[PDB]
Amino acid sequence: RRTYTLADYLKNTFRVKSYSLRWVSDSEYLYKQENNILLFNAEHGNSSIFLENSTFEIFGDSISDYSVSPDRLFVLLEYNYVKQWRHSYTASYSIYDLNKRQLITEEKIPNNTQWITWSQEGHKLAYVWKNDIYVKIEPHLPSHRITSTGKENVIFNGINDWVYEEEIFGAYSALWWSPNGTFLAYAQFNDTGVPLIEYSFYSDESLQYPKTVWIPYPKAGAVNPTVKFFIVNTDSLSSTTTTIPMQITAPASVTTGDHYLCDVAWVSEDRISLQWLRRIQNYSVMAICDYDKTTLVWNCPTTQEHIETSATGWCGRFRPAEPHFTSDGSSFYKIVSDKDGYKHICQFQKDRKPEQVCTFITKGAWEVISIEALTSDYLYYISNEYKEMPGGRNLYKIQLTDHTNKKCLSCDLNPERCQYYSVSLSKEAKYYQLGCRGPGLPLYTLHRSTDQKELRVLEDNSALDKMLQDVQMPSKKLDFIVLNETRFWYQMILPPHFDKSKKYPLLIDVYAGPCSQKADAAFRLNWATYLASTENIIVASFDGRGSGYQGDKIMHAINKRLGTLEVEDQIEAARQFLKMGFVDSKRVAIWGWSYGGYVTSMVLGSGSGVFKCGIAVAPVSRWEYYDSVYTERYMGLPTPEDNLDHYRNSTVMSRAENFKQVEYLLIHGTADDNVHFQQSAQISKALVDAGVDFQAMWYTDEDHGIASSTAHQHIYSHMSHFLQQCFSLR
Amino acid sequence: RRTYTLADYLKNTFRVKSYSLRWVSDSEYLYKQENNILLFNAEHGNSSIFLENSTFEIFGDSISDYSVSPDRLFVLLEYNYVKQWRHSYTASYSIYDLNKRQLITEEKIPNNTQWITWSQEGHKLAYVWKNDIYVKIEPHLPSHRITSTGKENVIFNGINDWVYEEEIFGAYSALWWSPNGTFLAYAQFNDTGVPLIEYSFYSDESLQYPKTVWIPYPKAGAVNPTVKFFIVNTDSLSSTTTTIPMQITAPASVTTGDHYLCDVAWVSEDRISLQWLRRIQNYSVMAICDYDKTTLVWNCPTTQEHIETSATGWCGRFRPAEPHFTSDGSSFYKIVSDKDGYKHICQFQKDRKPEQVCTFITKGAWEVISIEALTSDYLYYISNEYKEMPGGRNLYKIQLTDHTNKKCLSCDLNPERCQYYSVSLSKEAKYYQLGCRGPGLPLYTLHRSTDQKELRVLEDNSALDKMLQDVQMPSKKLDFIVLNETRFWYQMILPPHFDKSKKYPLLIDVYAGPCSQKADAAFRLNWATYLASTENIIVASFDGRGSGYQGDKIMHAINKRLGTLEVEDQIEAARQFLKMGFVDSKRVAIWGWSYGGYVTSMVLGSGSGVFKCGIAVAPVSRWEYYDSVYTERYMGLPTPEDNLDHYRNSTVMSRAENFKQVEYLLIHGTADDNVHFQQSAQISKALVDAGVDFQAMWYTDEDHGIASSTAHQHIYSHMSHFLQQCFSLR
Ligand SMILES: CN1C(=O)c2[nH]c(N3CCC[C@H](N)C3)[n+](Cc3ccccc3C#N)c2C1=O
């Protein structure tokens, strides 16, 4: 008879388990249990201690993470983790010799390492420190410095600069070991002409003069960082003081002007795959390069060029998808839009072929989310094909030799509980673990790839289940409304004993940025849960135009004009919800973070009358303020010769007036390096000039996620009270 | 039957007039009328056009101000005024030749001047541009560069650096022409070792990358700017390319360590008076320097040293009071604390006298506010002696030759309407205009100094009076409560038909910093007027310990320990008010700006339970954050060898916990160069860590005054709504 308290949320009272394993081979995997690394035999529960509760305590309680070498002979022990941006961070490392049973102490690894990683084979290491790349052929042996041009905020070697870490690659890493580890490829970035943004940092109240953090950040239209690609021969290191890395230069069709390095992928050990993108992500090229033994050089013949294009918008979802080559690297499968605009899988040949470079192996009004594994006979992927639910996820598999032999492997399993799967196949797809994130409580089970026999259940949240028993949890409808003759999905977090006859207050939850999906079949316990279980508020999300995985017609609809259709559709959806009866029209709100904050602001400032209040957290206020890679992908260049007009027309401050008819709460982090505060400061200024009262809240020294424990709790408490005041609850 | 709306305040509906004249001689004065400068004859209303409605319009509507040379031959026309700090600003100038009837156009004055001023005599001009001093013997003639060491944020010649402008002198100017204008003395400051503070400036939403403003600002304990005094011979200029200024060096008892230049005052044209203060304002020395014709050097013999001390606190109110020498500069009168701790006037001799340097000309438990004029037979001064009202201001006059012949010249006049006078005597005290700021509507009248005969009434706010007739204006009690057997004055802005039997909500208004006075007999039309007239809120102020002009016992009581007695006494006063009956104890609030924000915060966080809510605008949260000259004057150095403990003990963030029992609104300007935002940012962070919800509001690009039209209106509207919500009104 208890509800789900804001406190339950904030204090993480009801913990949701999972089973994050690490395949060490085609049949064994590692798993952390009570701070013990255990080696398990997929097949028979046969388990075994790999690393002890012990070991980790040597470096006390600061042991941030661990990395076992592929040959399972050593273990990287991470500690002194200091974050910096979304994925970047510096840490200290120790190499524990499993065999000799002790921490290697000789040629230690620098105490401020920016990035480290084993080879794909033995125990080779490559790490970046002070922006320079170093290599250790073996843990006991000394470092061999690979680059020396490294310099803070200027030259990045083997690590990404800010915009590259955030918008191109999903990480800080810009290193790629080859199979067999002969070569080590790496990217170099020059942030020279890139402008600087400089926010303040107050730190402890004991610091008398606040600090200034500067970051080379390219805002829409500004000069971007430049790239260069290199591959250095790792074997020679012992016979030289210095080795000379060979450089690969980007394809001709990309060098005429600004461009980006898209993706790196080793095919074999004498072949590497590189994807390049023009600054206007209209065009993209994937070059396949071969190593020349004779002239000791890498060649990227235009014959193996492969071009990807889009006359509707940009390439890929957030960039060209990644290639998956066969064993002999003669062919590769890659996800690309088909003639109808649906992201599907098609075969390619090393050599390009005059307007027939592809052969689609998938058709349909649905999309392949990702290619999970490629065997000598099978291609395992994940799609939202089943039951026509774009917000659902299932694991499929196609036999190469017979494309008709296509079978879903998760569809039967638990149709009720599981409609959103995550997969994880062993080194050669002999086994595969399934992660049911599905409607019901998450469920983890591993199967034998051959026949799909569910060997056992790794984790079923029974523990959580027994607890949620004494609690009145909300439900979640995931259906679709239909506009202009098209399906547009949405979801609702309905408070407990939801009575379709009564009238509840509505809270729209937004993102709605390009290729986003807020309406899906995944289980969650967030603030929306509390809002429904305790405040009896209906929290709904609506994937409109420019959204999710439903074809380019829907996703590209927003091209060159953000702050348009995706905002409208969001309002339209609220109307549609109202027509559904159980919504108290006099109590409808809308909130959002980042892009969601932008839309929230654009909606509240539309003077549509439909909304009473709204909260925008670290919103974007006009696109010239945001970075280049992201913004330009959808907006082009903010020049008069391109799209300056849509940039200036899609401003938040231009709608200040319409804010008089709305209660608004603007929140923003002081040390936000992604969305610069300048954006909110500009909004607030517009509102003050317009003579519009509103509420604001800054978070001292907080990130773009305002996720530090105390700040996190405070911001949701402050937002909860705002709604209670606005919905006349509390 | 109409109330005083918030709109009345914000739109300055009811304008209050005054009579700001400019004595051009001992019998005539200048006055601006409908943008026409008129010359009036004190005696007979005899008037006459000096400068027309015309002239000013040549420089359009950007004519910021005007300065008439003392020999009334030329007029300085200021325009293109661009503010910078409290008093600094740069403008463009034009010299209008009254006689030749047109704007001088030859050797024009640089388009970005930082400061200009006429000599005391003819038409000599001195101006600073690009941090360097220039002189023009006459308006048509060419500039003569006096310094060339000038450099932005490093070397200041003839103008004050940040701290000096804000805390030592009350302006930007550091130039001093001598009588007869032979010499030009100036100060030079080196901001070299002074640390930098760097806030962000966003500007129009069109600016893609925010700017950064850096200012050499010395926070408590930091390295301070250095000083140097020069006097240059203005007569030689035409016979050289460069003149060499002679330098005066501070007195020996001040040079051992950090010190400051206090005050400059020309005695005759061969004698100058300088005051110096040690960094620890415990000690001060006033040297009288004489010009040596033979060796062409200035001499400041220790025989004419004159020491000022304080074993209770610091020197003077905000620094040593200014000397006023006799015609032959043989003696001078200066306000200093007598044996009882009361600021009074006493006589001095050019030469110091072994512990008898002073002869007090005034006695009493009241203080002399200022020395207005010194005639060959009379000394006119302003005090709060009358009716024992420290919060009152009256013009007195003593006969040098006879210290008994002491007479008040304003006490009688309008005892009902006037209790707060401002004065303004002609070049030789033949006439004197009075500024009744008194209880009633401000009244301006001029008098023939001889017999006090009121020649006429210059301005009586009848226009205003006629208007306020149709409005329900609040009242204002100015009385005193008594604590620990001492009088402590307070004031109350009682709402219209205030009925002593009913119960109203209370709003404490605060500054309460060293030597402040919030309780006085001066008429005002502010936000407090609105609050009482329309919201029915009793706005009250209380001058507790560490306050006003009631002797050093009361003012120094706070020494070395701010955030103590002055905070408590404020709470005490609230209690006392409640005991007066007509206060609704369940609705007591307290707000303040600057130091007041600090106290407001220190009170709200005291957990005394006495207050419900409060507002702090640009508060100080811990003294290490504020500037040196101000902080140190009362707190000493933030070092373990001095007062570090009290600095650390008087923090606002240290009381975060107690804020859970209070609604708090923290407001702060983004471009605040006085109180750095770092201060509010540090407070918000403390409350977030403490798990205390509160309200905040930042003002983009706003000053420490948040005085820009739209901001000013927005901030008061926002605070009004805060109180309305808090007092359950609205
Ligand atoms: C709510 N929200 C959200 O969860 C998410 N993830 C992303 N991106 C995903 C691809 C990598 C990229 N770095 C971030 N965005 C895009 C975005 C748009 C406008 C402003 C800021 C951001 C940022 N962040 C957003 C959101 O708006």
UniProtKB/Swiss-Prot annotation, chains A, B:
<keyword id="KW-0720">Serine protease</keyword>
<dbReference type="GO" id="GO:0004177">
    <property type="term" value="F:aminopeptidase activity"/>
</dbReference>
<dbReference type="GO" id="GO:0046581">
    <property type="term" value="C:intercellular canaliculus"/>
</dbReference>
<dbReference type="GO" id="GO:0030139">
    <property type="term" value="C:endocytic vesicle"/>
</dbReference>
<dbReference type="GO" id="GO:0035641">
    <property type="term" value="P:locomotory exploration behavior"/>
</dbReference>
<dbReference type="GO" id="GO:0009986">
    <property type="term" value="C:cell surface"/>
</dbReference>
<keyword id="KW-0964">Secreted</keyword>
<comment type="subunit">
    <text>Monomer. Homodimer. Heterodimer with Seprase (FAP). Requires homodimerization for optimal dipeptidyl peptidase activity and T-cell costimulation. Found in a membrane raft complex, at least composed of BCL10, CARD11, DPP4 and IKBKB. Associates with collagen. Interacts with PTPRC; the interaction is enhanced in an interleukin-12-dependent manner in activated lymphocytes. Interacts (via extracellular domain) with ADA; does not inhibit its dipeptidyl peptidase activity. Interacts with CAV1 (via the N-terminus); the interaction is direct.</text>
</comment>
<dbReference type="GO" id="GO:0031295">
    <property type="term" value="P:T cell costimulation"/>
</dbReference>
<feature type="glycosylation site" description="N-linked (GlcNAc...) asparagine">
    <location>
        <position position="53"/>
    </location>
</feature>
<keyword id="KW-0031">Aminopeptidase</keyword>
<dbReference type="GO" id="GO:0005576">
    <property type="term" value="C:extracellular region"/>
</dbReference>
<keyword id="KW-1003">Cell membrane</keyword>
<dbReference type="InterPro" id="IPR029058">
    <property type="entry name" value="AB_hydrolase_fold"/>
</dbReference>
<feature type="active site" description="Charge relay system">
    <location>
        <position position="594"/>
    </location>
</feature>
<dbReference type="GO" id="GO:0042802">
    <property type="term" value="F:identical protein binding"/>
</dbReference>
<feature type="disulfide bond">
    <location>
        <begin position="346"/>
        <end position="358"/>
    </location>
</feature>
<feature type="disulfide bond">
    <location>
        <begin position="613"/>
        <end position="726"/>
    </location>
</feature>
<dbReference type="GO" id="GO:0002337">
    <property type="term" value="P:B-1a B cell differentiation"/>
</dbReference>
<dbReference type="GO" id="GO:0016324">
    <property type="term" value="C:apical plasma membrane"/>
</dbReference>
<dbReference type="GO" id="GO:0045121">
    <property type="term" value="C:membrane raft"/>
</dbReference>
<dbReference type="GO" id="GO:0030163">
    <property type="term" value="P:protein catabolic process"/>
</dbReference>
<dbReference type="InterPro" id="IPR001375">
    <property type="entry name" value="Peptidase_S9_cat"/>
</dbReference>
<dbReference type="GO" id="GO:0004252">
    <property type="term" value="F:serine-type endopeptidase activity"/>
</dbReference>
<keyword id="KW-0472">Membrane</keyword>
<dbReference type="Pfam" id="PF00326">
    <property type="entry name" value="Peptidase_S9"/>
</dbReference>
<keyword id="KW-0645">Protease</keyword>
<feature type="active site" description="Charge relay system">
    <location>
        <position position="704"/>
    </location>
</feature>
<keyword id="KW-1015">Disulfide bond</keyword>
<comment type="similarity">
    <text>Belongs to the peptidase S9B family. DPPIV subfamily.</text>
</comment>
<dbReference type="InterPro" id="IPR050278">
    <property type="entry name" value="Serine_Prot_S9B/DPPIV"/>
</dbReference>
<dbReference type="GO" id="GO:0001666">
    <property type="term" value="P:response to hypoxia"/>
</dbReference>
<dbReference type="GO" id="GO:0030027">
    <property type="term" value="C:lamellipodium"/>
</dbReference>
<feature type="glycosylation site" description="N-linked (GlcNAc...) asparagine">
    <location>
        <position position="282"/>
    </location>
</feature>
<feature type="active site" description="Charge relay system">
    <location>
        <position position="672"/>
    </location>
</feature>
<feature type="glycosylation site" description="N-linked (GlcNAc...) asparagine">
    <location>
        <position position="111"/>
    </location>
</feature>
<dbReference type="GO" id="GO:0045499">
    <property type="term" value="F:chemorepellent activity"/>
</dbReference>
<dbReference type="GO" id="GO:0002717">
    <property type="term" value="P:positive regulation of natural killer cell mediated immunity"/>
</dbReference>
<keyword id="KW-0965">Cell junction</keyword>
<feature type="topological domain" description="Extracellular">
    <location>
        <begin position="1"/>
        <end position="730"/>
    </location>
</feature>
<dbReference type="GO" id="GO:0031258">
    <property type="term" value="C:lamellipodium membrane"/>
</dbReference>
<dbReference type="GO" id="GO:0036343">
    <property type="term" value="P:psychomotor behavior"/>
</dbReference>
